[PDB]
Design a protein around this ligand. Structure first.
Ligand SMILES: [Zn+2]
Length: 36
């Protein structure tokens, strides 16, 4: 059993893509929020 020294911390609830910061994920949610 093995695991990496680093990883992605934040996740999209629309398309399951992941990010290093809350900011990087939060501005990605705008690509889904455009479908108003
Ligand atoms: Zn997404």
């Amino acid at each position: 059993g093995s695991s990496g020294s680093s990883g992605l911390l934040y996740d999209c609830h629309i398309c399951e893509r992941k990010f290093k910061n809350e900011l990087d994920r939060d501005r990605h949610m705008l690509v889904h929020g455009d479908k108003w």
